[PDB]
Design an enzyme around this catalytic site. Structure first.
Site, mmCIF file in Angstrom:
data_model
loop_
_atom_site.group_PDB
_atom_site.id
_atom_site.type_symbol
_atom_site.label_atom_id
_atom_site.label_comp_id
_atom_site.label_asym_id
_atom_site.label_seq_id
_atom_site.Cartn_x
_atom_site.Cartn_y
_atom_site.Cartn_z
ATOM 1 N N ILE A 1 -0.513 102.410 67.486
ATOM 2 C CA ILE A 1 -0.112 101.094 67.944
ATOM 3 C C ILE A 1 0.015 101.060 69.467
ATOM 4 O O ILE A 1 0.319 102.062 70.129
ATOM 5 C CB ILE A 1 1.189 100.608 67.276
ATOM 6 C CG1 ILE A 1 2.354 101.581 67.490
ATOM 7 C CG2 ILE A 1 0.934 100.320 65.789
ATOM 8 C CD1 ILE A 1 3.695 101.015 67.059
ATOM 9 N N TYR B 1 8.814 112.094 65.798
ATOM 10 C CA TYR B 1 9.325 110.732 65.814
ATOM 11 C C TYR B 1 9.989 110.382 64.496
ATOM 12 O O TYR B 1 9.742 110.994 63.455
ATOM 13 C CB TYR B 1 8.208 109.721 66.072
ATOM 14 C CG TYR B 1 7.241 109.592 64.917
ATOM 15 C CD1 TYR B 1 6.204 110.505 64.767
ATOM 16 C CD2 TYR B 1 7.377 108.606 63.939
ATOM 17 C CE1 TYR B 1 5.316 110.426 63.719
ATOM 18 C CE2 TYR B 1 6.477 108.539 62.854
ATOM 19 C CZ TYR B 1 5.447 109.458 62.768
ATOM 20 O OH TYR B 1 4.543 109.424 61.734
ATOM 21 N N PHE C 1 11.632 103.093 67.241
ATOM 22 C CA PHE C 1 11.284 104.493 67.158
ATOM 23 C C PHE C 1 12.166 105.331 68.062
ATOM 24 O O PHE C 1 12.510 104.924 69.170
ATOM 25 C CB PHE C 1 9.845 104.767 67.613
ATOM 26 C CG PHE C 1 8.799 104.165 66.732
ATOM 27 C CD1 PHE C 1 8.304 104.856 65.635
ATOM 28 C CD2 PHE C 1 8.264 102.918 67.014
ATOM 29 C CE1 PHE C 1 7.300 104.315 64.849
ATOM 30 C CE2 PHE C 1 7.263 102.382 66.216
ATOM 31 C CZ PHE C 1 6.776 103.074 65.145
ATOM 32 N N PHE D 1 11.011 104.131 57.778
ATOM 33 C CA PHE D 1 9.685 104.044 57.184
ATOM 34 C C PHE D 1 8.818 105.263 57.453
ATOM 35 O O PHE D 1 7.786 105.424 56.787
ATOM 36 C CB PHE D 1 8.949 102.756 57.608
ATOM 37 C CG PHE D 1 8.657 102.664 59.069
ATOM 38 C CD1 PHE D 1 7.498 103.194 59.604
ATOM 39 C CD2 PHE D 1 9.516 101.991 59.909
ATOM 40 C CE1 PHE D 1 7.246 103.094 60.976
ATOM 41 C CE2 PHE D 1 9.251 101.886 61.251
ATOM 42 C CZ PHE D 1 8.128 102.435 61.783
ATOM 43 N N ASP D 2 9.224 106.144 58.364
ATOM 44 C CA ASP D 2 8.403 107.307 58.646
ATOM 45 C C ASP D 2 9.202 108.290 59.498
ATOM 46 O O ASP D 2 10.086 107.901 60.262
ATOM 47 C CB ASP D 2 7.137 106.843 59.372
ATOM 48 C CG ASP D 2 6.039 107.863 59.369
ATOM 49 O OD1 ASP D 2 6.168 108.923 58.717
ATOM 50 O OD2 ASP D 2 5.030 107.568 60.052
ATOM 51 N N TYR E 1 2.086 96.211 64.433
ATOM 52 C CA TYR E 1 1.154 95.884 63.360
ATOM 53 C C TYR E 1 0.956 94.384 63.170
ATOM 54 O O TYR E 1 0.296 93.970 62.215
ATOM 55 C CB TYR E 1 1.560 96.586 62.059
ATOM 56 C CG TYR E 1 1.492 98.083 62.179
ATOM 57 C CD1 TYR E 1 0.285 98.742 62.065
ATOM 58 C CD2 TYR E 1 2.624 98.838 62.421
ATOM 59 C CE1 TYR E 1 0.192 100.105 62.195
ATOM 60 C CE2 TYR E 1 2.548 100.222 62.552
ATOM 61 C CZ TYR E 1 1.330 100.851 62.425
ATOM 62 O OH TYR E 1 1.220 102.211 62.559
#
Ligand code: NA
Ligand code: NA
Length: 128
Positions: free
Chosen positions: A75, A45, A118, A55-56, A101
């Protein structure tokens, strides 16, 4: 771009039909089967904030992210969204904070009240 497109053109996959998780299938996967509750799921992902920042990314770590589906280990949007995917599928998910979140956010990079984008690839799923 892709976040705008899933926002405006995505499918609501929530059981409440509250628009909280929107999905577009980008690469069609194999067969018909989706993973079952409790399966070990293996995903690649990338995640972006609504300000455009990454962010990731699991790709950048050279290893997939592994979790047990449907157990709240991720999540809510991921438990809901990954459960809809076929093996080999790539999708886009647009996740409102109530399925992510919330007001807490997540240090270091996810602010309060954040809508998240995502791209997710379902690599494999295995029961135990
Ligand atoms: Na598009
Ligand atoms: Na699917």
């Amino acid at each position: 771009g892709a976040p705008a497109t899933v926002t405006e053109q995505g499918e609501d996959i929530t059981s409440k039909k509250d628009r909280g998780v929107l999905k577009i299938v980008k690469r069609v996967g194999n067969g018909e089967e989706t993973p079952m509750i409790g399966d070990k799921v293996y995903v690649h992902y990338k995640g972006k904030l609504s300000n455009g920042k990454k962010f990731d990314s699991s790709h950048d770590r050279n290893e997939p992210f592994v979790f047990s589906l449907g157990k709240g280990q991720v999540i809510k949007a991921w438990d809901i969204g990954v459960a809809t995917m076929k093996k080999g599928e790539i999708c886009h998910l647009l996740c409102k904070p109530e399925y992510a979140y919330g007001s807490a956010g997540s240090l270091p990079k996810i602010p309060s009240n954040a809508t998240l984008f995502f791209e997710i690839e379902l690599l494999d799923f295995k029961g135990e």
